[PDB]
Amino acid sequence: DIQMTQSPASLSASVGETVTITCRASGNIHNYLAWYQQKQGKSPQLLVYNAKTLADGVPSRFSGSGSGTQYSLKINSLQPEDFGTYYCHHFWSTPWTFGGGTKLEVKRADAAPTVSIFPPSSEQLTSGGASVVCFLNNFYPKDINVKWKIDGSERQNGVLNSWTDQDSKDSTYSMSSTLTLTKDEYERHNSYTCEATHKTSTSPIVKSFNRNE
Amino acid sequence: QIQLVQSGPELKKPGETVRISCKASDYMTSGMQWVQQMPGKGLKWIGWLNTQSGVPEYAEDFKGRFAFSLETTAYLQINNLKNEDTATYFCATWGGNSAYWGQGTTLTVSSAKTTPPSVYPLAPGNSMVTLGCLVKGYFPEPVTVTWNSGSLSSGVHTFPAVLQSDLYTLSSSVTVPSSTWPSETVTCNVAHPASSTKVDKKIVPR
Numbered sequence A: 001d002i003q004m005t006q007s008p009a010s011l012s013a014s015v016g017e018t019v020t021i022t023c024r025a026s027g028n029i030h031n032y033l034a035w036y037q038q039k040q041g042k043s044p045q046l047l048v049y050n051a052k053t054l055a056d057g058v059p060s061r062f063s064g065s066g067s068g069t070q071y072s073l074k075i076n077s078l079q080p081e082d083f084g085t086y087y088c089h090h091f092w093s094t095p096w097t098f099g100g101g102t103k104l105e106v107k108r109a110d111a112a113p114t115v116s117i118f119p120p121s122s123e124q125l126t127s128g129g130a131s132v133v134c135f136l137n138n139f140y141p142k143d144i145n146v147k148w149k150i151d152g153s154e155r156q157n158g159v160l161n162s163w164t165d166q167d168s169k170d171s172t173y174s175m176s177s178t179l180t181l182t183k184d185e186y187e188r189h190n191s192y193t194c195e196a197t198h199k200t201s202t203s204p205i206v207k208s209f210n211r212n213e
Numbered sequence B: 001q002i003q004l005v006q007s008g009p010e011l012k013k014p015g016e017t018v019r020i021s022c023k024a025s026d027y028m029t030s031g032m033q034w035v036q037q038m039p040g041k042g043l044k045w046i047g048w049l050n051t052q053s054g055v056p057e058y059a060e061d062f063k064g065r066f067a068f069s070l071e072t073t074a075y076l077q078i079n080n081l082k083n084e085d086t087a088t089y090f091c092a093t094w095g096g097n098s099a100y101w102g103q104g105t106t107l108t109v110s111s112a113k114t115t116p117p118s119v120y121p122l123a124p125g126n127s128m129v130t131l132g133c134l135v136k137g138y139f140p141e142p143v144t145v146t147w148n149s150g151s152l153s154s155g156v157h158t159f160p161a162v163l164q165s166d167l168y169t170l171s172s173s174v175t176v177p178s179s180t181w182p183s184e185t186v187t188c189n190v191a192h193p194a195s196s197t198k199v200d201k202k203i204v205p206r
């Protein structure tokens, strides 16, 4: 069985630039390779097959090359619809394995997150629960860390986080951080603080509130 | 144009069986394949079916519990379902100068009982103000969230749900001018098709 090693796993670039994605087979696949593009979970779309033949409707700025065990997809003068994930797929012998994929994202200027903190709602409090929510919206680059503090002390348990994919409109990222507590637990403390650590600042970017106010 | 349509979302329990159909507008012409994609993961080839010889070929990890059939409609049958089969399944074929993939079919395999979400308003403790809605404890995925029945679409993004003890939770963020809220009402609409549920939560200032 032949496996495909695709690289790089992640790539960042801007409209107008050129990028190259490569795939290497563990055994000769004699040009039996296809390249696919996938947008936010949707059905993958064929770009090139047989290593170098462009599929119908595929812009000529896309081109595949290689032979034996080494192949690559070249994309020059990137267009905004070119950002997403790419996968190579050999079909020389079963199993027709896929490469691990390459995530191509938009490169833009750094942006500090806009932080918003939200105390538990009265409805949830009445039901006995207390979720404190923190939004870290529209920042770039994607790497970021969140740290919660209750009465000045860091809290680590009860925290669940989620991250959006790059925004198709402003190319930024967003993150939500939720600290779930019981009503009693939540009312045993006063100050709740959400702190983000991002490259846009050597200091924490914070937002907090006092249960009393 | 050649179009492959797949059957709707599936919800099953560990150990059960599921059949996913793939119906082509036309059609035996060249053979087809099925592909699996686990949440947030890459594409994984399940196998392909030589529509000519009727002979199928499966990838190691799928032999035994996954079977291809054809009746024109193509089928993917999975028995002895495990939680790990939770993913989106695609059927695909090819011909001429291209390939044709179906829209995909999502499958969720879990012991969890379909449970509607509890929706909570997220209001502030500037010229702009960010509001939100917490959608907690629902199963299975997904839920659709809109603001003011879709009238409020700009400055909006809904975070992916996280799974906490068989149940999913997510939140949605919306940013509007302070001159709009609370003067004008802002409401999030949450729909959970699996339980045929629809909930509206007005964002009221503290």
Ligand SMILES: C[C@]12CC[C@@H]3c4ccc(O)cc4CC[C@H]3[C@@H]1CC[C@@H]2O
Binding pocket: A034, A046, A049, A089, A090, A091, A096, B092, B093, B094, B095, B096, B097, B098, B099
């Ligand atoms: C469907 C694939 C891309 C499209 C390829 C194609 C595309 C056009 C055609 O006339 C024949 C073939 C044969 C192999 C196909 C490939 C098998 C693996 C890959 O996913």
